[PDB]
Amino acid sequence: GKLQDSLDAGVGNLVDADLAKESAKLQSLQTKQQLGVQALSIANQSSSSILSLF
Amino acid sequence: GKLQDSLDAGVGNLVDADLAKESAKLQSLQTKQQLGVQALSIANQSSSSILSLF
């Protein structure tokens, strides 16, 4: 019984994720995604400045 | 018989914990864990303020 418990604990050590860091990374990457969308939207407007010169 | 009783009492003195102290340490560490969870939840929000600037 103890050996099987140790084996299960070792599997969990190998594969289980640490969600405490994931909670911070999730919000950080949501903010990153919002800024990336806004920056790409700004970059889409480069051609509009040409029309003013004509 | 008296010597065996003395030896058992000696092992108990040398290993056994006094659970009245852990009766308080349990509650203190439960409160401290809740406080740490609260503080970590506050800390993960540090990146949220960037969206307001853009």
β-strand percent of chain A reads under 5%
Helical coverage of chain A, percent range:
over 70%
Structural class, from helix and strand content of chain A?
Answer: mainly alpha
**Radius of gyration based on Cα positions of chain A:** 24 Å
State the major sheet of chain A: none
Order of helices and strands of chain A: HHH
- The count of β-strands of chain A is 0
Give the termini separation of chain A.
83 Å
Q: Largest protein interface? A: A-B, 9 and 10 residues
Subunit organisation of the chains: part of a larger assembly
> Given the C-alpha coordinates, what overall shape of chain A results?
rod-shaped
Function (chains A, B): Flagellin is the subunit protein which polymerizes to form the filaments of bacterial flagella.
Protein name (chains A, B): Flagellin FljK
Subunit structure (chains A, B): In C.crescentus, the flagellar filament is composed of multiple flagellins of 29 kDa; 27 kDa and 25 kDa.
Subcellular location (chains A, B): Secreted; Bacterial flagellum
Describe the structure.
Chains A, B: In C.crescentus, the flagellar filament is composed of multiple flagellins of 29 kDa; 27 kDa and 25 kDa. Chains A, B: It is found in: Secreted; Bacterial flagellum. Chains A, B: This is Flagellin FljK. Chains A, B: Flagellin is the subunit protein which polymerizes to form the filaments of bacterial flagella. The structure is cut from a larger assembly and holds 2 copies of chain A (54 residues). Chain A has 54 residues and is an all-alpha fold. Helix content of chain A is 80%, strand content 0%. Chain A contains 3 helices and no strands. Chain A has helices at residues 2-15, 19-43, 48-51. The relative contact order of chain A is 0.06. Chain A binds chain B through residues 20, 23-24, 27-28, 31, 34-35, 38, and chain B through 40-41, 43-45, 47-48, 50-51, 54.
